[PDB]
Write a protein that binds this DNA or RNA. Structure first.
Length: 74
DNA sequence: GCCAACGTTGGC
DNA sequence: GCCAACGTTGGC
């Protein structure tokens, strides 16, 4: 489910077609930690909440959006 | 030229 | 001291 890594998965808190993936760092000082990425319906990758907000504009309110989990967490 | 994966760091 | 957010870069 939602806490699987290495798996592209729907993010139901975002508009239709958005997906999320958690990538485990393979090497270096933070090996084993993770980065979370989002993918637009067109497949473009997004790496931060401000980046999502710039792109989505007023079609979403990301104020309570938790980037790491992909859930709204007021 | 693109882009995933690394490391950096300002703001907290 | 941590980490959200991003810049850089080698490998392609």
């Amino acid at each position: 489910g939602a806490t699987e890594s290495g798996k592209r998965m729907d993010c139901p808190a975002l508009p239709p077609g958005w997906k999320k993936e958690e990538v485990i760092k393979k090497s270096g000082l933070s090996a084993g930690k993770s980065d979370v990425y989002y993918f637009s319906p067109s497949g473009k990758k997004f790496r931060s909440k401000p980046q999502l907000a710039r792109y989505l504009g007023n079609t979403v309110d990301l104020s309570s959006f938790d980037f790491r989990t992909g859930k709204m967490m007021p």
